[PDB]
Every structure is written in C-alpha cells, then in structure tokens.
C-alpha cells in the first residue's frame, strides 16, 4: 500500500524498505525531519 507517501519520499527507497518501515511511514508517524501534511 504505497498510495500515501510523505513529501520528498523516494519510491525506490520505499519499495526497497521492509514491510515494517512501509507501515511506519504509512501510519503517518515518526516525523522529525519535516512536518506532516495533515
């Protein structure tokens, strides 16, 4: 489920990361670098 990705997100890096990280970013959590777009 890569329909909702963060800003400046890298598809290659996303599909390359494990399901654990793919679910962490999809949940909309763990955002320190930039501010979420709610």
């Amino acid at each position: 489920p890569l329909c909702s990705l963060p800003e400046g997100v890298d598809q290659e890096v996303f599909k390359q990361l494990p399901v654990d990280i793919q679910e962490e970013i999809l949940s909309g959590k763990s955002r320190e670098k930039f501010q979420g777009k709610l």
Partner: protein, 76 residues
C-alpha cells in the same frame, strides 16, 4: 570501508566505518551528516533494522553497504 545511507527521501550519506566497529558508531556519523538523534535515527540492512548493541560484521555489513536511514517514532 565506506557505506552509503539512503534515507526515505532518497538522501545518500557516505560514512567511513569498519566491520569491527559497532552500529552505534555508524549512527553517530549520520548525526554529523544530517543531524538526526539516535532516538529518531533508524538503520535498515538485510531487510531488517539494526541495533546499537551489535557489530557491523554481525549484520554482514560489507563495503559500500547500501544502508537505509528511517525516522523513528517522534513526539510530533
């Protein structure tokens, strides 16, 4: 050996580490590179996340290893 850390934003970061060093050393480097603390800094190798209580060689971290930096749970 130098390793490349590609963040979720496709940001590659070259770090000079060794197969004998510990993950803690690799993470520290990224800090002086991007500026992310060990609380929000996460590593990804072999399809799994690494820990600070282990050695690079433990995860089979070879030269020019393609590491992936991920943001950990943060307050905001």
């Amino acid at each position: 050996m130098q390793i490349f850390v590609k963040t979720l934003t496709g940001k590659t970061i070259t770090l000079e580490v060794e197969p004998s060093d510990t993950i803690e050393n690799v993470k520290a480097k990224i800090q002086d590179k991007e500026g992310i603390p060990p609380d929000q800094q996460r590593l990804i190798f072999a399809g799994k996340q690494l820990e600070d209580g282990r050695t690079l060689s433990d995860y089979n971290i070879q030269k020019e290893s393609t590491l992936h930096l991920v943001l950990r749970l943060r307050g905001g």
